[PDB]
Amino acid sequence: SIGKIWLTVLFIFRIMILVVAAKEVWGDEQADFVCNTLQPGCKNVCYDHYFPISHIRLWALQLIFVSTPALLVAMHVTYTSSIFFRVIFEAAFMYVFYVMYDGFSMQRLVKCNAWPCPNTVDCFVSRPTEKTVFTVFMIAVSGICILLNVTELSYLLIR
Amino acid sequence: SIGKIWLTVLFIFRIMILVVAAKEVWGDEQADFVCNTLQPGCKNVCYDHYFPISHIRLWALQLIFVSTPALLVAMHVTYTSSIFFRVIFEAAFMYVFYVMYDGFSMQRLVKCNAWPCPNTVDCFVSRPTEKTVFTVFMIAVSGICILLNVTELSYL
Amino acid sequence: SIGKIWLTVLFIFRIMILVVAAKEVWGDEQADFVCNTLQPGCKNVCYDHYFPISHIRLWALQLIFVSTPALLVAMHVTYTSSIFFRVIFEAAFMYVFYVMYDGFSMQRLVKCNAWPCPNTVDCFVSRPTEKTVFTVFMIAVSGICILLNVTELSYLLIR
Amino acid sequence: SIGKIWLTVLFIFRIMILVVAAKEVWGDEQADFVCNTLQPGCKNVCYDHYFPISHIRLWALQLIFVSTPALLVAMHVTYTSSIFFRVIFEAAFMYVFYVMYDGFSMQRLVKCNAWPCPNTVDCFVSRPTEKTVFTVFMIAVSGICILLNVTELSYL
Amino acid sequence: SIGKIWLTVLFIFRIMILVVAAKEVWGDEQADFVCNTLQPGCKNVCYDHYFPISHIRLWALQLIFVSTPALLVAMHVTYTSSIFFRVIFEAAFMYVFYVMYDGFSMQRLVKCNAWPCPNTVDCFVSRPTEKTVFTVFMIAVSGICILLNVTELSYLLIR
Amino acid sequence: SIGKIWLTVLFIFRIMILVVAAKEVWGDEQADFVCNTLQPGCKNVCYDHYFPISHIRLWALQLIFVSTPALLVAMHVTYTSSIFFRVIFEAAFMYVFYVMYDGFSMQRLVKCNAWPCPNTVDCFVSRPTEKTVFTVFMIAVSGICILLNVTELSYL
Amino acid sequence: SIGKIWLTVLFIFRIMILVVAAKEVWGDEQADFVCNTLQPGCKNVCYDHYFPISHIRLWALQLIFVSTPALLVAMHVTYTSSIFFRVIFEAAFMYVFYVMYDGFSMQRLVKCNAWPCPNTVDCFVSRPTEKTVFTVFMIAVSGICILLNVTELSYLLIR
Amino acid sequence: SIGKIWLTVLFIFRIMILVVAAKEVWGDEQADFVCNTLQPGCKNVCYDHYFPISHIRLWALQLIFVSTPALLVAMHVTYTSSIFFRVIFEAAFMYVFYVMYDGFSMQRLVKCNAWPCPNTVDCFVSRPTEKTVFTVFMIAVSGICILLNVTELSYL
Amino acid sequence: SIGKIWLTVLFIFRIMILVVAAKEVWGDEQADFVCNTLQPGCKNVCYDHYFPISHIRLWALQLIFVSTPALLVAMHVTYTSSIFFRVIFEAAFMYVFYVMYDGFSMQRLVKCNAWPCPNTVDCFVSRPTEKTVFTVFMIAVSGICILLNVTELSYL
Amino acid sequence: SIGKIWLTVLFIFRIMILVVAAKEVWGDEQADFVCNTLQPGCKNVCYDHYFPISHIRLWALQLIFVSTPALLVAMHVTYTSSIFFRVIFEAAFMYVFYVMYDGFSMQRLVKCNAWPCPNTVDCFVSRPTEKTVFTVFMIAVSGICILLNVTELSYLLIR
Amino acid sequence: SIGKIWLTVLFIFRIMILVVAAKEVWGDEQADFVCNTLQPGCKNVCYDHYFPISHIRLWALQLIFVSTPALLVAMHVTYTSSIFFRVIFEAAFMYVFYVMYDGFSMQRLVKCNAWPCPNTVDCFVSRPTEKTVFTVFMIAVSGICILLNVTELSYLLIR
Amino acid sequence: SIGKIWLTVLFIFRIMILVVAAKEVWGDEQADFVCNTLQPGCKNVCYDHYFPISHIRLWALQLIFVSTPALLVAMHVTYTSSIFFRVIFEAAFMYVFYVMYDGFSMQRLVKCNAWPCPNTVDCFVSRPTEKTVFTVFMIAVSGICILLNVTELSYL
Ligand SMILES: [Ca+2]
Ligand SMILES: [Ca+2]
Ligand SMILES: [Ca+2]
Ligand SMILES: [Ca+2]
Ligand SMILES: [Ca+2]
Ligand SMILES: [Ca+2]
Ligand SMILES: [Ca+2]
Ligand SMILES: [Ca+2]
Ligand SMILES: [Ca+2]
Ligand SMILES: [Ca+2]
Ligand SMILES: [Ca+2]
Ligand SMILES: [Ca+2]
């Protein structure tokens, strides 16, 4: 139960990071996206292909899903049932970060060859290293919040 | 009894989703809209033809219409007659998403030949896949809020 | 007095609509305004001619005038005198919507021939249909808030 | 007694009006300013010559100066000596609107030939009619707040 | 002690002015800065030279320094020691306004000849007269807040 | 005892400073970044090479890391073990400012020849002197918060 | 027969004028044509409407037709038959200058409202007064060459 | 005998006409070609599709082919066998003007949707009426030179 | 007798001068004309107002008019009656250079406010000094050819 | 020897074609060359790769080489030696047209991926079909001038 | 009189050089002139100041003046009088090349500060070294043609 | 005797080659020159540094210098003393092609960092391969004309 503390400490850590991430690091997401091309739509299409669901929004949704269960239990006041969700969700949103983007590392260059683009065009990601760090932290916490939630889970099923 | 728990949770849910949808996903809805043309107005007319009421502003109206009936009650304090509204509205707004936009799926491209345009021209929707995801979540919860209010209806 | 409720219910309905209207639907009002011309000022002038007082601001003022009386009475605590204002104002701001703009329907094209413009230029309104809906609702409520206010008025002069 | 009712109402009134005026009507005051030239700085100098203190920033200062005297009293808690200020200020700011801008009416066009400009050039004010309306409302209430404070002055 | 009032009255006056100053008068500070040149960096460099520390930020810092002492004393609750700071600071930030900018008067034109610039370029300041007024008021108050603080200082050292 | 007074004051201090720094001084950090080139991406790559973590986002992380230990305590309510963190963090972030940026002084110019760029090119940092001032204030207070927490450490 | 001289003197006068006209005065004919519009084709169309057959080419053709007969007779060596042609042609090409262009006077402004053009656009003719003079001379000579040719005609039919 | 008079006259005629046509009327044939697009190559491909052999270069080839047979004779010095060519050539080139260009009349507009173009686009021919006139004169004389050489053929 | 020597020499002189003047000095007369404006047509109208007949095209006409009388004679082969023309023409064209252009000196700048222009605007003549030199040489020789033909006139 | 005539007839045919080819058909050769790219040099490089020696210049050189021998013999006046050159040259310059350009047919599109170009870029040839015809004729004549030259060659070695 | 030959040999040498000079080396004279400025007229004015009379035209005039006398004598056929002109002229046009341009050496950079220019602007001369050579040759010949003309002059006044 | 045959042939040869080279191959020499920069003058200075005397203008001078000696003779009508010049000139101009341009091979790219340029920049020579071919032909014939005049020299 001295871990139910750290959960609250880390639950905020990822938030204030997500804020800094969502606003300064990422900022106007697609505006910063650059492609060597005079082709209209080629940039819009190349962005959609490599970012079906951008990071800030995955993390947005993730934190929304790792929060709804915490609300459910407060409404019943099924507590063990909530812990289950907060794990599979928080872990599911890590699988969607490996698949898609591939490996918690931001690209500096993606070579898109979608339709409007006449040939393969060099699209350049803005500010990747800074973004990378904020993946690490966001993913680290996401990974840690799991362990503490599995612990409290077992602590109920063992005892 | 447990029914009106989820209804407030999912209500709060679809809101935070709607926020992220409006501010980030859609962003400056029309400004991100791109067309292959140099004709002044062709973009504005082809955006009107294909998006007469943007998703965010429908959902905006949706969450408004599905909120008045639950406020009528709070003021009077009829209730069963409000839920009658909370269903048909939330369903009506679901109808205007299949009709218009042609089925909860963002078109990656649309071809408009409205008057200002010299001929038919390519217009490229930005971020269709991500918008598509959020339409699903917004329509799913909408499809869900229907049930809980009908189970509550059939419960009486 | 079960109508003094609906007045409060509709008084908010037009607001949250005005917000959605003022921000998303309309947004940067004149920036979205387009005219086929390389003439500086021709756009600024053509906008002033067809929109002496834009909608969001009429509705802004309208709601300010259909609110000042409600404040006056709270300060006296002349109640029937306040109801009178909330009607003529709310109705006056409907006459200024018929005259000017002509018929609660947004134009898709206005052909301006003001001074800076060399000849008549085709100015294109952005996003008219969406705006039109929000006139209907804003005008509907404006029209309904009248009826309920005239009712309460008569209910005092009859009884 | 009934006098200090309207004074707070109209004070709140002119504020909400001032808001809509600053944020929407005027908007990005200078950015909307357009001139028929390709000279860097001609626009900035012709905006300074004709708008040394933008309407919104005068009214901003106005509502500031007409607020300190009514705060002096609250702190001390003189009062009749504050109203003396609340009149002359609100009137002084009325003087700088006839002088400067040349009579509560927005010029649709101004012709500036300041140094950077090669000659005299057309500069087109955006949205003059709407700004004109709001000047009227801001000056009207200002003209009114004068009376209620003079009636209150003559009342004593 | 009827002066400790006016201090609070003037401490706010400069603020609400600083707000109007920081937002409307100045606004996007460097964006409004114009230079007759096609030289990249020449504008950025010419701005840095003539504005090492812009006004709004000096006033920002000034008010931060003429506030920290007022917080210190509230934490002890050395009261005379705080008055000392609020003077030297508030006065120091007036010396940095004379030196730099030279004389509480905004330039309408500065002729910069820094490196990237090929030759001397005419850089034009936006909206100087309006800014000038707001210096006067900001500096006036700054100058007045001193007198009242020196008075209260002496009132403690004399009595 | 008097030590934990200044620590909260200077903590509040460096915040308001950090605000003005982020919103005004730095502003739109990268957008103000200018390079002498016409190559798409050369600017974005030369900004990544020389600013892998912008000052504001380091300090953002800094004030975050130097805040968790002081929250661990509030929740448990160890304390002496938190101050151990409050020092090393605030010092570690001081190390990444000498390393990276090359010594608390904003470069007025940087010369990047990353791949997209055809050769080495001039890139001009905007507002280096003012940023330099704020780095000093942010590092000074950081250097100070170290002492008060070590005096508090040596005090025990 | 002392007039058959002047015919040769004036036949060259119009030529060297046509050269100066065709090259310097007119020059790149359509390139100099300007229209206040961003509409592609609107300029090309507005030019075709007001200049179905430009001057230099009418004069080119005219001089070709007032020359072919002079060649015919040289080939027979029907002499009176040639004089007839050189008149009707040289006069026909004056009717096509009145009709079309209207009155041997070049416009300074033509207001075209052809299809591609969104509305009526102000198209500006380059260098009209200079062109006008060269019409006068070209038309004067054209008019004089007639008189001398009708004289020689009658001199054969009378005698 | 009188037949071979006009044939040299009209031959010289159609030349001077061809000159004025090439240098002034058509001018820089393709450069004057305008299309409503921003796609690189769409103009070049739509000019190739609709003008595989420009009028001037057909007539150029025409006057070449209708000149060799009259040179064969001068060198040999057969003659009646050359006139056989001087007819069929001058007629064949008349066929490729009805086919291609679709009947001796310059199209004021053509609508091309070749690959590079995103869709069908407006392409505006410059000076169609004047070109039309010269096609008439070039085809008329061509139609005439046929007769004089057939009368000369039937004369034998 | 020696008079008609120089007259042919200086005639050949002013020609070669006129050539260099037209092709190099003046060049593309109007294209080199620059105005401080973004108004379509303001340049074309301000060139018409100030140069109704360009120098080169006057001199072109000049050398034409002063050549016909000397051709009348060659054909007739009256002569003394031609020289009468060769003087008045060459003098008349001298009059239209003082009037118009305002005295054999190229204006470095002209200020035109014809209709299309929003106001008065700077228009900068290119290469005024060099053009000025050639006007002098063209007018000098013109002033000289007058004398030799008047001495020849007074000689008879 | 009635073939030595046709040689002179065809020797001119290719010329007047080359003129029409060099001036109107081809014209400003590289200016008409278009590539979908904002890359400086990418067009210059892509042109050099696909056109090491453009057609008009090959034909220019060809005709220079199929002419020098005809001059040599006129200077001696080794006649059979000249015929030999006029063949191998005229035929060599046909091998350089097959190799390079590949098959007497002009491309409408070439996909260049040379250095300055970021990726493969679509370069568009202007006016290919017209050019193609003029290859056929230029190559036809080139091919015919061979046969007549080999005939006259054999006519000397047989007899 | 074996020098009257070389005069004719050098009189042509400067010509064919002037041609190469006038066309390729110099070419479109002012078009190649570049100035770092967005100021209209500043380039036109800066060109007029540093090139009151460009080289090709001085040489054009020079050769016209060193030719008129050679024509005069042919018309008389005062021979010694012609030699005098061909010297002072050919030498006068060397003084106007020292004064103006200063020293038979073309600038690579001229810093113009004429009126339209806001401040001093860097104007860049195109292709100076090549031009310089052609001054040397044009001036060399000009200098040599003098010596031979003074010789023939003295040869008449001595003998 | 047969030697002075080829010398006139190859002289005429290298001319027609020089023509095609100047007008078509090189064309507008500098205008086709492209550099990756936005600095006014960087292109003009980097063209001067790497092409102080363009190929065409060297060969222009070459054919001039190798023509005077053969004209000295025609006028005098020494001869053997002219051939002495016709060799050294034609050889000297061969030296300034190895030195300068660095060996009869057109550089496809050159990297210039002259003053106006901010740093070293890519400058792309247009049509290097074709120019290379013509340098070969011009230098080959030049290398040949040397022999025939030395054989003619050694013949005496
Ligand atoms: Ca964002
Ligand atoms: Ca939005
Ligand atoms: Ca707005
Ligand atoms: Ca504002
Ligand atoms: Ca700011
Ligand atoms: Ca920022
Ligand atoms: Ca022309
Ligand atoms: Ca052509
Ligand atoms: Ca000219
Ligand atoms: Ca060419
Ligand atoms: Ca030239
Ligand atoms: Ca050239």
Author numbering:
A (entry chain A), C (entry chain A), E (entry chain A), G (entry chain A), J (entry chain A), K (entry chain A): 19 to 95, 135 to 216
B (entry chain B), D (entry chain B), F (entry chain B), H (entry chain B), I (entry chain B), L (entry chain B): 19 to 95, 135 to 213
Article excerpt on this structure:
Connexins (Cx) are a 21-member family of integral membrane proteins with four transmembrane (TM) domains (M1–M4), two extracellular loops (E1 and E2), a cytoplasmic (CL) M2–M3 loop and cytoplasmic N- and C-terminal domains (NT and CT). Cx monomers assemble as hexameric hemichannels (or connexons) with a central axial pore. Hemichannels from adjacent cells dock to form intercellular, dodecameric gap junction channels (GJCs), which can cluster to form gap junction plaques in the plasma membrane.
The difference density peaks reside between the carboxylates of two glutamate residues and the carbonyl oxygen of a glycine, suggestive of a divalent cation-binding site. Ca2+ coordination is mediated by the carboxylate of E47 and the carbonyl oxygen of G45 in one subunit and the carboxylate of E42 in the adjacent subunit. The average coordination distance in the refined model (2.6 Å), the coordination number (CN=5) and the formal charge of the site (-2) are consistent with mean values reported in an analysis of nearly 1,500 non-EF hand Ca2+-binding proteins for which high-resolution crystal structures were available. However, the major inter-subunit interface is between M1 and M2 (> 500 Å2), and includes a salt bridge between E42 and R75, which is not present in the Ca2+-free structure. For the Ca2+-bound structure, the five-coordinate Ca2+ ions resulted in an almost entirely positive electrostatic surface potential for the protein lining the pore. For the Ca2+-bound channel, K+ ions were almost completely excluded from the pore. Electrostatic calculations and MD simulations revealed that block of K+ permeation is achieved by the extensive positive surface potential conferred by the bound Ca2+; that is, Ca2+-binding creates an electrostatic barrier that impedes cation entry into the pore.
